[model samples]
Target: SMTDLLSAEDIKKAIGAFTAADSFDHKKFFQMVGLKKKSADDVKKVFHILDKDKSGFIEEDELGSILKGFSSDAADLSAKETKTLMAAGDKDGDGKIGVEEFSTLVAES
Candidate 1:
């Protein structure tokens, strides 16, 4: 594992600190995890974490459990929510998201 700065314990802490909601809270999750304060260089590191299959992208299947990337106990994004998620992050207008696209979303999210 290329483990570095972040930890599972702290990841859970940040996820719990963020308010749980029916609607996806984009900026809130980023703020809670301090992604809003993160640099894209490291932000792409988070992208890799979410790219669970090591396929170099976050596809719809990966997006369903997207929150789980932060904390296993977190809820999955809904069918509609995943679409909304992809639309926002898949800047290339593809079915999946690249490191650069994900970094951009997290950087400005």
Candidate 2:
């Protein structure tokens, strides 16, 4: 289950640094980014913003709702993919995610 989705302001802030000149292609959003897998730099930026502890890693307790929130089928993500994501990104090694692990794993996706 997910919690509050990113507000319009939150989303705006998230995308604000992105400039059309930075090759901000909407097509990529639907292709890879659309699938919730952002580029590595973008992933790093997002984690920096959300990782309050400034830890290099994120823990599952802090990230579950967001993972659940971010998941949707812009493209098909199989159940296996879902499990793999949870495993790889769940920094506590729990069956949930931490922001850092999630972001890194998402980038890989």
Candidate 3:
């Protein structure tokens, strides 16, 4: 996904300056973005924000558009990235992601 939103160079510079992870580990990604330590309410804020269409679940439609949901940068996801994220969050096999699952996705990462 290429999201050059650049609203904050802190994120860009922080990531650019930090030591790289093995690859794209959400564990590191979340921590790198400070989401790992965010309070639960804040987590819900992120969850609700991502659950577009108010379906109470995050389907691939919502999943694929996640970059923009978090950042207006008009950033987009790779088809693979969308599925990878969704799959990780599909804890109950709903084929979609629930808020609990979403929470786990961020924290468990």
**In TM-score terms, which candidate is top?**
1
Q: Rate the local accuracy (lDDT) of all candidates.
A: 0.74, 0.43, 0.67
Candidate 1 lDDT, 64-83, residue by residue in tens? 78888776677888798889
Pick out the ten consecutive residues of candidate 2 with the lowest summed lDDT.
65-74
What is the lDDT, from 0 to 100, of the residue 14 in candidate 3? Answer: 31
Clash pairs, model 2 backbone: 29-34
Rank list by lDDT: 1, 3, 2
The TM-score values for the models, in the order shown, are 0.79, 0.37, 0.75
lDDT of 3 by residue, 11-100 (tens): 453344434333444555556656677787787777777787888888988887765664555445567777888777798887899889
Question: How do the residues 1-108 of candidate 2 rate in per-residue lDDT, one tens digit apiece?
Answer: 111323444344333434545533222322332435445565556555434456654444333323223332223234554454456566666564555665555555
Q: Which of the predicted structures, 2 or 3, would earn the higher lDDT when compared with the native?
A: 3
Q: Name the weakest run of 10 consecutive residues (lDDT summed) in model 1.
A: 1-10
Comparing 1 with 2 on lDDT, the higher-scoring candidate is 1
Candidate 3: segments with Cα more than 4 A from true spot? 1-24
